[PDB]
Amino acid sequence: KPITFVVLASVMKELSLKASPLRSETAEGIVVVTTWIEKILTDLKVQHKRVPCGKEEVSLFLTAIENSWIHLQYLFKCLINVKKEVDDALVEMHWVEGQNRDLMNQLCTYIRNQIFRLVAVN
Numbered sequence: 001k002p003i004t005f006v007v008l009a010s011v012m013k014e015l016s017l018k019a020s021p022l023r024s025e026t027a028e029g030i031v032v033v034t035t036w037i038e039k040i041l042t043d044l045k046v047q048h049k050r051v052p053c054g055k056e057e058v059s060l061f062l063t064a065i066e067n068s069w070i071h072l073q074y075l076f077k078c079l080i081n082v083k084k085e086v087d088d089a090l091v092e093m094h095w096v097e098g099q100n101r102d103l104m105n106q107l108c109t110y111i112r113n114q115i116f117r118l119v120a121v122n
Contacts, residue, residue, distance in 0.1 A: 002081075003108045007033050007089040007115065014119045030082045033089050033115075034058040037080060040114045048080075057083035066103055074099050078107070 007015075012029040019032050034050075037060065041048050046064045053059035060080040067073035076098025083090045091112070095104045 002092040002094045003104055004090055004092050005108065005112045006085070007091060009087040009089075011115070011119055012089055014121070015115070018118060018121055028084075030056075030058050030084045030089050033091070034060065034080075034082045036115065036118065037082070037091075037111060040111055051079070053081065054083070057081050064103075064107060066098065066100060068099065076100070076103060078104060 009029065012033060015036055016026070016029070016032050019035070020026055038048065041060070041062060044064075046062055048060045048062035051059045051061045058081075060082075062078050062080060063075060064078070065073065065075050077096040079092075079094040079096060081090075081092040081094070083092065091108075093104055093108045095101050
């Protein structure tokens, strides 16, 4: 029952350019996006590994840590799929293990937010 968000085929094009401005047309669109999610996660010192996936997607398995303390610690687990849907990229995130399922939305909203900061490279 996964959270999703599209990356538009133009946002991909801009992510490719950022991945190599001085060259062109190197790698698939979903692959480029995935390696930008991989950049975003390592920067958070989130652990992740690419896992076997389907023919028309790339998958990250990731392990983040959460802390639940009192009155303003634990490990949670997610599968990110980056699948080519229509012309654009569909990003699915599946909650696998952990306490607060709503931390996925926090991580997903963050990642997708991080993507669009990168694309404002204008």
